[PDB]
Amino acid sequence: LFPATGYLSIVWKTLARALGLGVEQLPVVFEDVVLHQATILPKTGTVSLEVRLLEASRAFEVSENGNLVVSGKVYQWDDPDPRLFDHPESPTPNPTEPLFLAQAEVYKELRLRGYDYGPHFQGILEASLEGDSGRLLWKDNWVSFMDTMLQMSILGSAKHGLYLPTRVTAIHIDPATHRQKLYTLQDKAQVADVVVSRWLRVTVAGGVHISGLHTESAPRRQQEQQVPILEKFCFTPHTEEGCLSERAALQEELQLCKGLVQALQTPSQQELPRLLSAACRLQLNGNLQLELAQVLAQERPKLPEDPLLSGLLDSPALKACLDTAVENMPSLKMKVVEVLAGHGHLYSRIPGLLSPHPLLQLSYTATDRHPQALEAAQAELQQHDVAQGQWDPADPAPSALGSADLLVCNCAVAALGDPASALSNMVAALREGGFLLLHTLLRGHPLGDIVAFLTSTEPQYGQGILSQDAWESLFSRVSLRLVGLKKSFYGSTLFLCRRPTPQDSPIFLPVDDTSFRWVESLKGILADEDSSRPVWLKAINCATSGVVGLVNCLRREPGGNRLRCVLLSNLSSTSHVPEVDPGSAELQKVLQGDLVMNVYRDGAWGAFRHFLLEEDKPEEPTAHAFVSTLTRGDLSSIRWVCSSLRHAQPTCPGAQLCTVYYASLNFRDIMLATGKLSPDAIPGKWTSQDSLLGMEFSGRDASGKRVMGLVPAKGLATSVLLSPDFLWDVPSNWTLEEAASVPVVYSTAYYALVVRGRVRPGETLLIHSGSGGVGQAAIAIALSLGCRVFTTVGSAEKRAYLQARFPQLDSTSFANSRDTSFEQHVLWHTGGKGVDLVLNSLAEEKLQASVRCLATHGRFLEIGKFDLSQNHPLGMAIFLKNVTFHGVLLDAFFNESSADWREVWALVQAGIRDGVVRPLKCTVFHGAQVEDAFRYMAQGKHIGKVVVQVLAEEPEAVLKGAKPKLMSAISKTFCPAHKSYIIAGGLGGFGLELAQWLIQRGVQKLVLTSRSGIRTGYQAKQVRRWRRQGVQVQVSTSNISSLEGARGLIAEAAQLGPVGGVFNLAVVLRDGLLENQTPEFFQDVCKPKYSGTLNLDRVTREACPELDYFVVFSSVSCGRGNAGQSNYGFANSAMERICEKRRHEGLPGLAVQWGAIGDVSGTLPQRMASCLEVLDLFLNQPHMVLSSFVLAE
Amino acid sequence: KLQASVRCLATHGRFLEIGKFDLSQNHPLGMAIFLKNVTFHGVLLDAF
């Protein structure tokens, strides 16, 4: 974006030219600078700005393509006053200056805020912890200097989000005094001082003076260019049974097929059952199903879509098998080539499932008997790297393909002819090792035999359907070995065979030493370049071993292609302890498989794998929830999410929690939901960025008494906490549906008229928008006194409605609100005097018309927000007529001024008693149709107030119930306000932000552990701000590495309050290739991650009964492997085992595998906001280990 | 002076204008102050 101070330089140079001087001798004054639209400089091309000066009027103008950009007054400073730039009298001399922000810390804070300033705009050499005094670097440009002054202004503020200059009241510049104010640092760089004074609203730096700076929230670009791919790391046994037994749709499909088969031997909405029905209508025995036999070949192209046939592919089994294939690949590049692609259609699936791998180079070709088929979807092939080729199973593989890594057939649907020839040709073609992925049906199960019957063609071999032992023996003939099998309920299977590679006797290295002495041994073994004996690591004793990460990190390292691991980690303490010995048969088979990863958990032989996590947002039953716009400006994203009111069981008499039967929608809510209004324009440091919907409700108090109240926000919910001073007692005659409409509209009407306009009987007043709630309340109040009322409406039906509701009105008391014609009406019917009170919720051109209607001694009440927000001019000449221009904002009561509110409360109550306060009309929607209500109000045809029925009303006056009915709202993480939370290494770059997240989510008692304590300005600023907010932060030096340290840390947390959460973010990095590593390096790297987490586990099992969160952060190096981080991998992989073993028992546990963190591999850094949102997602899942990274490009 | 004095107004402030020049010249008045509850009074005792 073009800097706001950039326009200043342009206009300044224009004036200098017009005066015949230069910038270096033209002290200048700006006044009433208004920035209208932000200009977005393009990547290529240029943008043209023209500056026109009205010298006589001392006004300028900046325009772009005929559109106004900036406007204001610029004139020379005739007689500069050097003392104007003196640093204003300060409240504190600030002598100590103990800690301060350096450039890196200040711009890290700014970047977290949203600003992405680069080098040329980085000028704040250092700043105070409050952003009130600083030291600004001086290059020879003014744009950067003034932009840095504005950056200093922004830095110290407490608000969040992106704020940009919109209005400035006065700027004074004096280059001579500026050059007199600069000075040289100990280096050769020039520098100037800056002071920000919020009390006086002035920023002074050198020969510049910014006063009256106004900044307004800017909508986020909603680009969300980062979409992290999220996976779950779960154990996966090599052999599985009943793969799809969980599903019932496939069960119903098979039931229908079984019924059709019984009909044959004793809906047609899916391919296989429809073909079965086609057989049924005819006689299978008669004519040898000649007609159907001809029709049998017709359906084969559409046959694979059958959900029964393609169930295994859709299941995670295919992903697991492909992941196993890629893991054993010696390098990051793989070669795979289909066979019989014209029927298997695996080209669609395999490339997609392998995409999440960040560093996978894939070569794919679809090989078919006849090109006439694969040409059918050639276009659908081009977008992917899938190549083209002609090949037959019986024929030998052309040397073009030759050594192949992976071979996918899907013969379950494709016709493989003779299995012997196909297997022979393939296994010969396959590279030594490699993999042969085959998907075929089986005999000995209903679907297989049914299809076999249906087939009338030899080449399919009944679709090549044999018994499981038949396939196993055939594999035996071709010398392959099975390293994968996945049976399915409906009989389909998924084999994965690996052509063996001859190997010498492996070298076994136990890895159970506690001192990491084996690191020397493994290094020595791997040193030898000329050798191929594969090392087989053993991790038998410690189930908290992390050899998986060690292996992954070492595969990429030199000579790492000869590394295999065997770990025996059983979560259940009562499982069989395997005998892994050179003579043991179990070791014989596991070594025969020639598979890198071999973990034996709870009686099985599998390997950890990755799987894409379900995208659905977790949902839970919950009494307390609120309406949230998960994406601003998209009413279709409305939904119900959990609320912090679930906590706060004890409550002081000052507040009391109330159920919400009917919640109203006011116009502010529509503006917020549509995005036309920011979430920070409302007073009160809400900080949620959402949940600011709803201002009034009608429900029942805790005691069961009926009530209606007004709240600053969060009224659209199933519960609402507020002080009793903002509640009224709905009378017996009315109904809660009616009571929802009274509060806000009548309170604002009374406060505007009686308390501000001090209206009296016999007065004439103009009330705009008569049909609206405020209009109707004002009309009802006015006529009760006995006033004469003019109203403006937008249609004839609204005139009819107002006439029906208010009989006292007459045809002469209505005007038009869509034009400025009402001015003439009011002036004519009033005799030209005008009106006394005016209530104006209207826009610019119409607001001026209202001012012309005021009579002498009139009073203009402004309840709108557009002209006031944009700072439009108001001619003072109207005041020569005795006139009071009021500005009414009812929301000012919630923040402060509680003494005045009781007056409005009493006025409203008196009106309700007397009968003046009569409920408006209500168009009631339901709890599940909140979006419908929002859209209906957006249309604007509503007369009366839209309402939402959260719950129905019982007949009785009092019920003294316990809790409302339970609904289903998106689950989100909130924490009690009476529990403590521990963040090991909480002063690091990540951990301060995790605390900030926790503090925003309710945490009041926090403990941060760090070896060196507070040591930087950023940490001091953060801790001071949190303590000022009222949080009992407490920094401890307890090192969780030793058990004494863990016990002490938990003791401190308990003394502060019961321990609820434990987050371990401690990290010490000692990077290096295996050749340069040492045992002590591994010890140091594993102290905080592996020993600390074990000690936390022990201490929490001993003395933490109310704990609900146990989170430990890992890295993708453990999962995807990384070269030169072996110690990091071993430390992290060992953490995951503890978390997994905690959940099998029942205790909380969760380990996150992050990618790269940006704000504080082949994957881009992930911004902090996305990280925290994804983290909020992960704390609700039922899983153990989870991952999050953003793929490159 | 008048524009400087407006900015001194606090929340729920009240401005009394017993002057006449700025009113007679119909000089502009920024309406952004009314976002703070503020009443602008034009006091003319000649009207009684």
Ligand SMILES: NC(=O)C1=CN([C@@H]2O[C@H](COP(=O)(O)OP(=O)(O)OC[C@H]3O[C@@H](n4cnc5c(N)ncnc54)[C@H](OP(=O)(O)O)[C@@H]3O)[C@@H](O)[C@H]2O)C=CC1
């Ligand atoms: N700070 C304060 O003191 C408070 C401020 N207010 C403001 O005062 C006003 C009171 O109105 P409110 O109670 O919200 O009533 P509504 O928003 O329900 O109605 C607003 C009025 O504006 C017109 N209108 C409504 N919807 C549309 C639309 N979609 N398109 C065009 N015109 C429309 C109608 O008049 P017409 O028939 O002429 O179309 C209608 O009577 C609002 O501007 C509100 O923001 C309200 C209370 C507190």
Ligand SMILES: NC(=O)C1=CN([C@@H]2O[C@H](COP(=O)(O)OP(=O)(O)OC[C@H]3O[C@@H](n4cnc5c(N)ncnc54)[C@H](OP(=O)(O)O)[C@@H]3O)[C@@H](O)[C@H]2O)C=CC1
């Ligand atoms: N790119 C990234 O940042 C990624 C990070 N992660 C995860 O995030 C975390 C990194 O934390 P982050 O703050 O960013 O890293 P930093 O290195 O910036 O901070 C680490 C913190 O841990 C503290 N610490 C280390 N060992 C101990 C110990 N024995 N006792 C007490 N405190 C200790 C350090 O104390 P001191 O200040 O004295 O040094 C420091 O405060 C790890 O859990 C890691 O797995 C993983 C993936 C991506």
